[PDB]
Sequence to fold (420 residues):
Amino acid sequence: KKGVLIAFEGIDGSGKSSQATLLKDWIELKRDVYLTEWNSSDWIHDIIKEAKKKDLLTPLTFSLIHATDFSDRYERYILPMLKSGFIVISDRYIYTAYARDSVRGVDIDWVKKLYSFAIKPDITFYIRVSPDIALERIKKSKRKIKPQEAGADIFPGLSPEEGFLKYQGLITEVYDKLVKDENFIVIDGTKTPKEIQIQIRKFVGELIDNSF
Amino acid sequence: KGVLIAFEGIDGSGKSSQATLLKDWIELKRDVYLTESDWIHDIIKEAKKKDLLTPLTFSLIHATDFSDRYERYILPMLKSGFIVISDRYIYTAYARDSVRGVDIDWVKKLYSFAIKPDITFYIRVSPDIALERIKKSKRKIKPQEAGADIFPGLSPEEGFLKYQGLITEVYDKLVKDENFIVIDGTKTPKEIQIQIRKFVGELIDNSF
Ligand SMILES: [Cl-]
Ligand SMILES: [Cl-]
Fold:
């Protein structure tokens, strides 16, 4: 009957992506649902970054490019679907921008005001896990750490492993500082994917049943 | 010792001409920089193919462009002791965005990373005279100058009168709070520039 916005926040390797997908799989059995990812930038993002590919951009300009691109995604896809009664699940939401931008020196209060045009999630799940554990999982999966996951732009002198630990650690600190103000539902990401999802569904089930 | 001088006014007010003329003159005395974006037009063009471009996104596109030029050119130059002149500063955005429905207070917060000019000249003139000039010179009114997105269907000329009128209302309400130096744009280019040079000189000739 009413649209609902569910957000997932967590570091790379925390498993929040899997949890968002698992929740979509369950919700779609009964209701219309749309799953998106913060990382899924659109056309404005591409036009500006390509146009300025030869120039060195500042954290502030990147913050604005991302907000600009999101403002379009928001009005074009997200908000319309919510108004239509869709349940929207976002694998990483505006809080990821809060973290990525503030860790790079952009004023936190300014970034919050910048994104004030966007509605807050009905529920935000923070899949919390130590960067050390997240790293172990990535190592065991045999895949390599991406420069972005290692915050290579900030820590080019560190190995991908050390960069990951330092950078994801800073992202974790931002999320931790946002928990109380943003009413994050903190989930112990060290638990099994199944136990985590069960907890999530209990929270979401209660939410939807009381949604009318 | 860096001084930021901004020029504001409607299209056809001569703000751009006055800004450049001032730069050419200050260049004879001190280090000075005149602020001078393709991709924006490419976004608007692509947006038309996508049937949507909200005032909010439009506001952010320009703020993004401004942030780049501010942090890579304006701010560094001011820190190099340069006098920086801009024919378009944050107030241009205040008007452009607020007439399209964007909360001006949010726009003020958006651009709060930028310092306020040491001097802001507001070349004020009625849209009627600005238009009369524009078409006294054989120039064509472009879509942006006519507020085509706000007043679609109107001839560029008719849209110009209405759009620039709305823009003027915003500049007028910023005068007191932003300490705008209001100039009668009906004066000749020479009269205006000579008065501007005398004013700026009285301020920087005894500091340099
Ligand atoms: Cl992360
Ligand atoms: Cl990240």
In short: The interface with chain A takes residues 38-39, 42-43, 46, 50, 52-54, 56-57, 60-61, 63-64, 67-68, 71-72, 106, 109-110, 112-113 of chain B (CB under 8 Å). Residues A 11-12, 168, 171 surround chloride ion (ligand 1) (CB under 6 Å). Residues 141 and 157 of chain B are 7 Å apart (CA to CA). Residues 1-208 of chain B form a domain with the Rossmann fold fold (CATH 3.40.50.300).
